[PDB]
Every structure is written in structure tokens, then in C-alpha cells.
């Protein structure tokens, strides 16, 4: 079975996987910011690490703009059965995002839980 997520739940689940980032990561997370899209262009796909150019690093006002990861409401909610199942999801896709975005593997991240 699959659980049926509405976008502004899912945007809660988001926030409730963000909470529960090992702090471990937390630091890696620094101007790292999660947007939620339906359907990747590749139907694999949970998430999507977006880096910034330098160039559009920065606003005019001085600002400076985050880093993305995608996730895909779809491909996640399909393979749960649950909220929290979702939560965990979303929670394993911005940790492994972020952690490959620093050079970090698959087996590292088993040494860290993931």
C-alpha cells in the first residue's frame, strides 16, 4: 500500500525530518534549503542535490541564497505506508543528498547510521 500525502502535510513531514537530522550532519546542512516537487524528470529519483552558481550566489541586497535538495513527494509516498514511514523517507533523502554532495558514501554513512 501507499499513503496519501496532501502538499501542506508534506511540507510538515519536511520540517518534522529536518528536526530529526543527526546532528552530525547539521553543520554539512548549513544553507542547504529542502523544496518539495511531485515528479523528478527521471522517475528514480527521491531527491535532487541543486548547487548554486557563484554568480547567483548572492543577492543584491546582499543576501546569499541556499543550496537546494529536492524531494519528490510522489516517489516517496509511494513507497510508504505511513506519516511517519514518510518522515523517515524524506529524513534518509536529504541526509544521503547532503552527505554525497561532500564526498561522503553509502558505506560511511552505514557508519553513520544511514
Same mark, same amino acid.
Given at each position: 500500500?501507499? #499513503?496519501? *500525502?496532501?502538499?501542506?502535510?508534506? =511540507?510538515?513531514?519536511?520540517?518534522?525530518?529536518?528536526? &530529526? $537530522? %543527526?546532528?552530525?550532519?547539521?553543520?554539512?546542512?548549513?544553507?542547504?534549503? #529542502?523544496? *518539495?516537487?511531485?515528479?523528478?524528470? =527521471?522517475?528514480?529519483?527521491?531527491?535532487?542535490?541543486? &548547487? $548554486? %552558481?557563484?554568480?547567483?550566489?548572492?543577492?543584491?541586497?546582499?543576501?546569499?541564497?541556499?543550496?537546494?535538495?529536492?524531494?519528490?513527494?510522489?516517489?516517496?509516498?509511494?513507497?510508504?505506508?505511513?506519516?511517519?514511514?514518510?518522515?523517515?523517507?524524506?529524513?534518509?533523502?536529504?541526509?544521503?543528498?547532503?552527505?554525497?554532495?561532500?564526498?561522503?558514501?553509502?558505506?560511511?554513512?552505514?557508519?553513520?547510521?544511514?
Amino acid at each position: 500500500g501507499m #499513503v496519501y *500525502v496532501d502538499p501542506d502535510r508534506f =511540507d510538515e513531514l519536511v520540517a518534522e525530518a529536518l528536526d &530529526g $537530522i %543527526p546532528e552530525e550532519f547539521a553543520r554539512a546542512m548549513r544553507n542547504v534549503a #529542502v523544496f *518539495v516537487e511531485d515528479e523528478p524528470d =527521471d522517475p528514480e529519483l527521491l531527491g535532487l542535490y541543486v &548547487g $548554486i %552558481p557563484l554568480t547567483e550566489r548572492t543577492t543584491a541586497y546582499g543576501g546569499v541564497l541556499p543550496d537546494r535538495i529536492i524531494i519528490y513527494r510522489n516517489t516517496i509516498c509511494a513507497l510508504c505506508e505511513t506519516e511517519s514511514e514518510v518522515i523517515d523517507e524524506v529524513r534518509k533523502t536529504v541526509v544521503h543528498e547532503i552527505a554525497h554532495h561532500f564526498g561522503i558514501d553509502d558505506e560511511r554513512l552505514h557508519e553513520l547510521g544511514y
